[PDB]
Assembly symmetry: C3
């Protein structure tokens, strides 16, 4: 079988680097439909990594419609134990600047219309999201960033990510409100991704790429002709360097994650009480 | 007809007590589908009480999928005028400890994906939820708790219950955020139950059983082998004693509730303007 | 073709004034279904205005079920460039009194179950809602209010509108929470209306009519026999005077709105990459 211990979720061409060898595609069907796009597999110095383009090829999906359950289920069928999610974010804080990266340790789920569990319809489980982003993988990302020797910006850790429904950007009042809730960065995609990955017993952490001040800072800038091209471009290229470094550390270090046994004390419906349809739907998630 | 003035909504075997006589089951169909499980009826010292197992037998439903509308409609068809809802909650406050009970007077609805009204599709009404939990029934619960002489814990009143979608437990950031909104306890089930009960003109109040500190307090405890069994067990048994006391007080005192006429000044669409399908669907709710 | 530069969204009989000539109705079909009701067109001193009864005739729709997408799409097909949305609101602030009007400059979207974009299913766009209510149209509304010489109340500007799902009114705890988020007024209808209007490149602003203190102020008053009739009546009649004044100013002044080109730098999927079904669905929104 095609198999990977590690996966990256982000934009396409995160995988488009000569360092990534024997680039190949796999179509995985799941009980939840198809993932956003064929998962790309290849090796980074002999280590197999799965890359999943969250928004599909050509960026064809809005955050609200991303098939999060199919995406996470498909990664679980490849045997993925670690996920690095890479995403563009607005800053809510003066010291978090465009081209900086942020490794949050906390999250607040403000999304509204997304299916955010694998459970229901015949099975009940309540995983803990107290620490929603694996601190072992977040600590690796910090060292990976340093190892990547990135030229512009700095990397910040121990930050709070607020996830909103989208697809519109926030009003100034909502931005002010997120600041008062002590959030630091804002995106649209890492919820319910983090909740599902937890249910799937996969360690999950985020590498956030600051792309502008959310509107708490009136600018209408870093969204220009000579800018958001270079901005997004540079973030994307820098992000690729960090991921290369992170893969090598995850491969050699293999940190134990609390996510790895998240299901075992959370499951309320014993497997022997599930219907056949339920057990089948949940098969890759179960022990 | 089978009839009850009072109903309890909670776990099964709230009704499993020798004091409850001529235990019987009734299957009630509603315009909203079936309730979570057959309603159990019996007498507590001659007084008939309906018990409804919110999560179904064997705890088979997640909070998000509980058929709240069918549950409340079915209780209304039995002529229920008072509901005591019993539910497990996390504490957001140092002085609210595991095995304590809490009688909240306020609620904040943070649920996302639940149908939370009987209205729409041919009828418009806007009930007031200013006081979402009947203070007459909440005052009875306080005296009932004292009357029950419970051995462990204490009971706290005038608290705020935040209801979240689930099924996962909160991140630490969300727990911090609920604390800043001045919530005291967190659960997943009493919304939209309280809104529907109000629309149904039934007095409704909550008895909350503290089962752990929500993650604002890092522990990984009171969820152990020698613990969450005894914890949940003891809460359940203590809860049964309080309910016995509450039923006797509600029966002898019959307090007037503002919930009893909540529909009459809230209804925008006069009954004579409703279609036949609408009037039929809403029949048990109307005057 | 039937055509209007300006539209009013509110209660019926906003248009029921002798000043409004050659009153006529148009049934507009959209890719989203039908609008809440036939749009009424007529002239205010030679200027053609579209009036759309948000809740349908006889107030038959709850806020949650209003067909916001069909409503905004239909107005866009009439060539509307400016929308004044008129809505009843609860006050969260002592200085905002019943019969006052409020022209908010900010909004916080707390609605849960409303489709709040035209995008998805084949097209991706992210408009900025930083300033969600056109300040040119809001400045006109302030001068229009003064010009209308309204007898009771005053008009307040630069306020924050929190939009909730409904249909029930807020608990006291939620009202306290909105106050702490610095919201000033509460309604149920201007989201997703404002987001859709932005996507549609139409300038949009709200005239809010204070109809009572939200429950942060315990009263059970201005909802009485000799009151909420006169209250709502007077608000409605005063609102009509302001709208007359606003139309004349919008017609002579024709302010440029940032909403007018909101789509052009927000669209991620180029038109040439859309399917035929997508381009067709979105036709009136595109360049």
């Amino acid at each position: 079988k095609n198999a990977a211990d590690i996966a990256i979720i982000g934009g396409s061409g995160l995988y488009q680097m000569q360092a990534l060898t024997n680039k190949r595609s796999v179509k995985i069907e799941t009980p939840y439909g198809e993932p956003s796009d064929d998962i790309v597999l290849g090796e980074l110095n002999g280590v197999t990594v799965a890359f999943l383009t969250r928004h599909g090829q050509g960026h064809r999906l809005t955050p609200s419609e991303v098939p999060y359950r199919a995406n996470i289920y498909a990664l679980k069928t490849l045997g993925v134990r670690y996920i690095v999610s890479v995403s563009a974010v607005g800053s809510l804080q003066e010291t978090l600047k465009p081209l900086d990266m942020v490794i949050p340790d906390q999250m607040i789920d403000m999304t509204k219309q997304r299916v955010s569990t694998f459970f229901g319809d015949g099975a009940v489980a309540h995983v803990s999201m107290a620490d929603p982003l694996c601190p072992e993988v977040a600590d690796i990302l910090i060292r990976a960033y340093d190892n990547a020797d990135i030229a512009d910006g700095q990397c910040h850790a121990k930050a709070t990510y607020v996830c909103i429904e989208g697809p519109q950007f926030s009003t100034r009042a909502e931005s002010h409100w997120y600041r008062q809730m002590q959030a630091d960065i804002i995106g649209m995609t890492n919820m319910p991704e983090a909740k599902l990955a937890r249910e799937a017993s996969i360690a999950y952490a985020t590498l956030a790429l600051v792309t502008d001040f959310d509107c708490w800072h009136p600018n209408e800038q870093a969204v220009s002709a000579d800018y958001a091209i270079q901005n997004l471009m540079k973030n994307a290229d820098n992000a690729q360097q960090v991921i290369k470094q992170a893969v090598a550390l995850i491969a050699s270090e293999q940190p134990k994650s609390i996510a790895h046994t998240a299901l075992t004390q959370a499951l309320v419906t014993p497997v022997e009480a599930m219907s056949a349809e339920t057990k089948t739907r949940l098969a890759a998630l179960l022990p």
